[PDB]
Design an enzyme around this catalytic site. Structure first.
Site, PDB file in Angstrom:
ATOM      1  CE  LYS A  25      -0.429  -1.235   4.441  1.00 29.46           C
ATOM      2  NZ  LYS A  25      -1.378  -2.170   5.248  1.00 29.46           N
ATOM      3  CG  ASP A 145       9.649   7.710  -2.913  1.00 28.17           C
ATOM      4  OD1 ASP A 145      10.147   8.613  -1.792  1.00 28.17           O
ATOM      5  OD2 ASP A 145       8.896   7.233  -2.742  1.00 28.17           O
TER       6      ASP A 145
HETATM    7  C1  LIG Z   1       5.901  -8.558  -3.030  1.00 29.51           C
HETATM    8  C2  LIG Z   1       6.082  -7.294  -4.054  1.00 29.51           C
HETATM    9  N1  LIG Z   1       6.379  -7.625  -5.426  1.00 29.51           N
HETATM   10  C3  LIG Z   1       6.216  -6.323  -6.023  1.00 29.51           C
HETATM   11  C4  LIG Z   1       6.668  -6.187  -7.237  1.00 29.51           C
HETATM   12  C5  LIG Z   1       6.212  -4.444  -7.440  1.00 29.51           C
HETATM   13  C6  LIG Z   1       5.922  -3.704  -6.739  1.00 29.51           C
HETATM   14  C7  LIG Z   1       5.513  -2.330  -6.961  1.00 29.51           C
HETATM   15  C8  LIG Z   1       6.193  -1.763  -8.112  1.00 29.51           C
HETATM   16  C9  LIG Z   1       5.956  -0.381  -8.291  1.00 29.51           C
HETATM   17  N2  LIG Z   1       6.485   0.094  -9.521  1.00 29.51           N
HETATM   18  N3  LIG Z   1       5.777   0.519  -7.367  1.00 29.51           N
HETATM   19  C10 LIG Z   1       5.313  -0.006  -5.954  1.00 29.51           C
HETATM   20  N4  LIG Z   1       4.761   1.057  -5.281  1.00 29.51           N
HETATM   21  C11 LIG Z   1       5.305  -1.379  -5.984  1.00 29.51           C
HETATM   22  N5  LIG Z   1       5.711  -4.079  -5.289  1.00 29.51           N
HETATM   23  C12 LIG Z   1       5.812  -5.618  -5.223  1.00 29.51           C
HETATM   24  N6  LIG Z   1       5.732  -6.192  -4.056  1.00 29.51           N
HETATM   25  C13 LIG Z   1       5.447  -5.841  -2.386  1.00 29.51           C
HETATM   26  C14 LIG Z   1       4.922  -4.537  -2.314  1.00 29.51           C
HETATM   27  O1  LIG Z   1       6.139  -3.749  -1.956  1.00 29.51           O
HETATM   28  C15 LIG Z   1       5.899  -2.528  -1.936  1.00 29.51           C
HETATM   29  C16 LIG Z   1       7.143  -1.365  -1.968  1.00 29.51           C
HETATM   30  C17 LIG Z   1       6.926  -0.048  -2.050  1.00 29.51           C
HETATM   31  C18 LIG Z   1       5.578   0.434  -1.811  1.00 29.51           C
HETATM   32  C19 LIG Z   1       4.484  -0.472  -2.156  1.00 29.51           C
HETATM   33  N7  LIG Z   1       4.815  -1.705  -1.829  1.00 29.51           N
END
Ligand SMILES: Cc1nc2ccc(-c3cc(N)nc(N)c3)nc2n1CCOc1ccccn1
EC number: 2.7.11.23
Length: 336
Positions: A25, A145
């Site tokens: 999130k 970021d």
């Molecule tokens: C487990 C997992 N695989 C992922 C692959 C991609 C992304 C992914 C890709 C992109 N461009 N922006 C975000 N915000 C998350 N987030 C993944 N997460 C778990 C969640 O992490 C996170 C990390 C930061 C913020 C939110 N959530």
């Protein structure tokens, strides 16, 4: 009703995505773990809120990720892979390769005592390679970021990492957002309201790598003034030629009659400028952070001096002389 998409565990989208659960999130919306029934594989689906500001950010993210995917170089694989994107129930949905936990989770696993210098080095080398990729002229992408939450292990047992989240990103020479970078990782040029380029990401990397080894943020400001004061504790008063050009210099500093700069006293204490030495924060000669690495293999005074020297090059106040990714990769910290 609300900007978020409502999601029930077990539901199936367009007879394809078994929404397993919610794995993430942010201000952008939600990330869901879903099984791609068609491709027989796990995917992370980033569901963008149905609000124009977050939709605009996500369309810049889609454009920069597709720009990067056009490149024939192995370096692009330090950036999370966007598989596809589609509209679904009036939300933009970005489908990513499924990754493992973020570097803050990894620090939490150590009770914030830090990972080894050996693992720190492996993260540093990959991150410098990712910054080298972003600095390719035809890309010139500023991530804007970088923080441990936005660096993810590919696999829970291995050292391989990838950068996520290009939602706040821009290209060289753009000014789009009022405030950029996560506060603890925010470069002096951004605090000072000066023009910013790819060097701000290198600053963030410097802060990240110290936090990964010590377990705690190098500069944990509660606000902008506290952030700048924490930076000055370690690195001293910024150079006069920087502060003389800085729109927000007088938010933090005051010019003396003799032309030199000093800290503005807060409307109330900090350690004197430059007295919180990175040499002691890293415990170069005293067994590493809190003495916890004393005698351990891979934690010698020589290893620590190379680490400290590379970090101080990444945390140069002058964005013009701050070490660039190409040169960072040539540093003696990384020599086989
Ligand atoms: C487990 C997992 N695989 C992922 C692959 C991609 C992304 C992914 C890709 C992109 N461009 N922006 C975000 N915000 C998350 N987030 C993944 N997460 C778990 C969640 O992490 C996170 C990390 C930061 C913020 C939110 N959530």
């Amino acid at each position: 009703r609300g900007s978020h998409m409502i999601v029930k565990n077990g539901e199936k989208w367009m007879d394809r995505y078994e929404i397993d659960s919610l794995i993430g999130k942010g201000s952008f919306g939600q990330v869901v773990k879903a099984y791609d029934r068609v491709e027989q594989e796990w995917v992370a689906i980033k569901i963008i809120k149905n609000k124009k500001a977050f939709l605009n950010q996500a369309q810049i993210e889609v454009r920069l990720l597709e720009l990067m995917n056009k490149h024939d170089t192995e370096m692009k694989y330090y950036i999370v892979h966007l598989k596809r994107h589609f509209m679904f129930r009036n939300h933009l949905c970005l489908v990513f390769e499924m990754l493992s936990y973020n570097l803050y989770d990894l620090l939490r696993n150590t009770n914030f005592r830090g990972v080894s210098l050996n693992l720190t080095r492996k993260f540093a080398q990959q991150m410098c390679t990712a910054l080298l990729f972003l600095a390719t002229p035809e890309l010139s992408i500023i991530h804007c970021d970088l923080k441990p939450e936005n660096i993810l292990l590919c696999n829970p047992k291995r050292s391989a990492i990838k950068i996520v989240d290009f939602g706040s990103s821009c290209q060289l020479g753009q000014r789009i957002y009022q405030y950029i970078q996560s506060r603890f990782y925010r470069s002096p040029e951004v605090l000072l309201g000066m023009p910013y380029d790819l060097a701000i990401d290198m600053w963030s990397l410097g802060c990240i790598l110290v936090e990964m080894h010590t377990g705690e943020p190098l500069f944990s400001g509660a606000n902008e003034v506290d952030q700048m004061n924490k930076i000055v504790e370690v690195l001293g008063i910024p150079p006069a030629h920087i502060l003389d050009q800085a729109p927000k210099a007088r938010k933090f500093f005051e010019k003396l009659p003799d032309g030199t700069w000093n800290l503005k006293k807060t409307k109330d204490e900090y350690k004197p400028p430059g007295t919180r030495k990175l040499h002691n924060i890293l415990g170069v000669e005293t067994g590493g952070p809190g003495g916890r690495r004393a005698g351990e293999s891979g934690h010698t005074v020589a290893d620590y001096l190379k680490f400290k020297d590379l970090i101080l090059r990444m945390l140069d106040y002058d964005p013009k002389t701050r070490i660039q990714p190409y040169y960072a990769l040539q540093h003696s910290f990384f020599k086989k």
